[PDB]
From a paper:
HU proteins are the most abundant DNA-binding proteins in prokaryotic organisms and play an essential role in processes of DNA replication, repair, and recombination. HU proteins are small (approximately 90 amino acids per monomer) basic dimeric proteins that are annotated in the majority of bacteria with sequenced genomes. All HU dimers feature a compact architecture, including several intertwined α-helices, two three-stranded β-sheets, and two disordered arms that are flexible in the absence of DNA19. Recently, the HU protein from [name], an insect parasite infecting honey bees31, was produced in E. coli, purified, and crystallized, and the three-dimensional structure of this protein, referred as HUSpm, was solved at high resolution.
Numbering used by the authors:
A (entry chain A), B (entry chain A): -1 to 93
């Protein structure tokens, strides 16, 4: 199965209709992930208790070879973000 | 740096004070991740546009050996959840 962000936001809106509208639920859901992204972009690890942690990772630069010339190259570094599932999520998935 | 769930919820509360209280911001932030967990527990992939995707993964069972006896064992399967950062997050981290 699948659950999208819009579906998440719709569930928020349905379960918190006393708190906020469907439009605000979508705004806030978008803000959750935007803010998490902003934090990763700022180099922060984002820890979400009961859920897990996000950290920026960097594929390190390293020596390669030009295959044709056997000249030393640099394979460039690049960043990504990694999630490590927390203990509670791991427990819930293994029940 | 670090950003926790409480800090995320506090940012939500600060930036959406017209929408919800600090208490509700924490409730909703907790619900976001609880609901995502519920979806993974239900076997759903959770796709969050602009952010990335979570999927349940299973470390497959496989043959091991009892080291001492050379009897065939089974190393048990276990589930976890994996996140794959979306293109936009990858772009933002590499800017
Ligand atoms: Na609305
Ligand atoms: Na409050």
């Amino acid at each position: 199965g699948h659950m999208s962000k819009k579906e998440l936001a719709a569930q928020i809106a349905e379960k918190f209709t006393d708190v906020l509208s469907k439009t605000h639920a979508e705004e806030i859901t978008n803000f959750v992930f935007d803010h998490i992204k902003k934090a990763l972009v700022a180099g922060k690890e984002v820890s979400i208790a009961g859920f897990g942690k996000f950290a920026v990772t960097e594929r390190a630069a390293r020596d390669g070879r030009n295959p044709s010339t056997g000249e030393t190259i640099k394979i460039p570094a690049s960043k990504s973000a990694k999630f490590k599932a927390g203990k509670q999520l791991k427990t819930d998935l293994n029940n």
